[PDB]
Structure 1
């Protein structure tokens, strides 16, 4: 039906069925996640397999079948045969190393478990970064990504609990997202804080003048290197775009884009130009000596805009010689039979 309620109910229901106890459950899971790490590494040590591979195979066996490996990541790990071979060596690990295998999986499991339980935490956080320009679900989602980030770095040895830790790692993920996706035209985090500062400043300035500050105040109040050109620019970038498709004029049936003209396209007038221009330019180019005429025709009209570097083997003196003598004979007879005079431009 309507999307917010369903997810809210979705995880709130599962937290309702499994909140994590303050100390015990979070400690429990934490301890297991870490042991997983120490496990996987020792596994790489004895298998010679990259901890990335050992990590992905324990993931498959605990989080999903061939289905989850084939669609998400296209196909480098053979759906069946590949992952299985990897599990066989894990089995071969005697009593000593087999232990790490069994731990890795159980660890991985705990991980996901700690992640489920602290989803209300995200939503509670994400709840306040609402009207920034991101959908609540998008916001919760990035924040979620943030909590997963936290899980990777939490050191349970250092007594502080995951609550306070997740907060930071989530708030960071969100704010980033808000700064990277919120607009149509990307704007770096610096420009963002800059705009917030700009905004906040305009607020304190609205406070007493009764005059929406000229870009003079803003420069001042802002600080060290602020000037009118700077603020006029920033607020020009702050205005989000408009809709090429918006209800226009009297709101009846008016769509905004019919009004904007076009520039690259040669309005007939231009197509006719290029026709005479090229035919006449082409007639002259042939009646001349190819030597320095083509040099300048090609050097200028074929690739890019170098007198010396323009002529093949013959030096500058023959260039200027024929360039300026052919260019003038060409111009002066074109003066006689006036075809070019009428500036095609």
Structure 2
């Protein structure tokens, strides 16, 4: 039906059935996650397989079958045969290293478990970064990505619990997202804070003048290198765009984009231009020596805009010689049979 309530219910129901106890459960899972790490590395050490590989095979066996490996990541790990080979060597690990295998999996579980339990934490957080320009679900989701990040670095040896730790790792993820996706025309985090500062400042300035600050105040109040050109620029980027399609005038049926003309397209007038221009330019190009005329014709009209580097073997003296003598005989006979004079442009 309507999307927010369902997920809210969705995880709030699962937290409702499994919140994590303050110390015990978070301690428990934490301990298992770390042991998993220490396990997977020791597995890498004895199998010579990359910890990345050991991590994905334990994931498959605990999180999902061939289905989850084939659709998500296209196909480099054979759906069946590949992962399985890897599990076999894991079995072969005698009593000593088999232990790590068994631990890795259970640890992997804990992870996902701890991650589940602290989803209320995200939503509570993500709740306040609401009106920034991101969808609540989008916001919770990035924040979610943030909590997963926290899970990778938390050291349970250092007594502090996951609560205060997740907060940071989540707030970071959110703010980033807000600054990275909120606008159509991307704007790095600095410009963002810049804009918040600009706004905030404009607020303190609205406080007493009764005059929406000329861009003079904003410069001053902002600080060190702020000037009028800077503020007019920043608020010009701050304006989000407009719907190219917006209801216009009497919104009966007016869509904004019919009124913008087109520039690359040669309006008839131009197509006609290019025809005579090319036909007459082509007539002159022939009745001439195919030497310094083509040099300057190709150097100017075929590639890019070098007198010396313009002519093949013959040096500068013959270039200027024929360039300026042919260019003028060409212009002065074109002065006679006036065809070009009427500036095609």
Normalising by structure 1, we get a TM-score of: 1.00
Cα distance in structure 2, aligned partners of 1:249 and 1:26: 60
Return the offset for 1:288: 0.3
Cα distance in structure 2, aligned partners of 1:195 and 1:331: 57
Cα distance in structure 2, aligned partners of 1:220 and 1:310: 54
Return the offset for 1:202: 0.2
Return the offset for 1:51: 0.1
**1:70-117 deviation digits (Å, cap 9, x = unpaired):** 000000000000000000000000000000000000000000000000
Return the offset for 1:129: 0.2
Mapping for residues 176-325 of structure 1, pairs under 5 Å: 176-325=176-325
Return the offset for 1:319: 0.1
**1:12-46 deviation digits (Å, cap 9, x = unpaired):** 00000000000000000000000000000000000
Mapping for residues 127-166 of structure 1, pairs under 5 Å: 127-166=127-166
Return the offset for 1:211: 0.3
Normalising by structure 2, we get a TM-score of: 1.00
SS at match of 1:262: coil
Cα distance in structure 2, aligned partners of 1:159 and 1:303: 69
Cα distance in structure 2, aligned partners of 1:297 and 1:93: 77
Cα distance in structure 2, aligned partners of 1:38 and 1:198: 48
- What's the C-alpha RMSD, in Å, of the aligned pairs? 0.2
Cα distance in structure 2, aligned partners of 1:155 and 1:210: 54
Return the offset for 1:139: 0.2
- Long gaps (5+) in structure 2: none
Runs of 4+ in structure 1 deviating by more than 6 angstroms, as ranges, are none
Return the offset for 1:336: 0.1
Return the offset for 1:201: 0.2
Return the offset for 1:238: 0.1
Q: Alignment length, in residue pairs? A: 345
Cα distance in structure 2, aligned partners of 1:330 and 1:139: 69
Cα distance in structure 1, aligned partners of 2:85 and 2:288: 77
Cα distance in structure 2, aligned partners of 1:253 and 1:297: 52
Return the offset for 1:228: 0.1
**1:164-220 deviation digits (Å, cap 9, x = unpaired):** 000000000000000000000000000000000000000000000000000000000
**1:95-146 deviation digits (Å, cap 9, x = unpaired):** 0000000000000000000000000000000000000000000000000000
Cα distance in structure 2, aligned partners of 1:239 and 1:254: 23
Cα distance in structure 1, aligned partners of 2:331 and 2:246: 54
Cα distance in structure 2, aligned partners of 1:225 and 1:97: 62
Return the offset for 1:249: 0.9
Cα distance in structure 1, aligned partners of 2:20 and 2:299: 75
Cα distance in structure 2, aligned partners of 1:115 and 1:301: 64
Cα distance in structure 1, aligned partners of 2:243 and 2:111: 45
Cα distance in structure 2, aligned partners of 1:92 and 1:268: 79
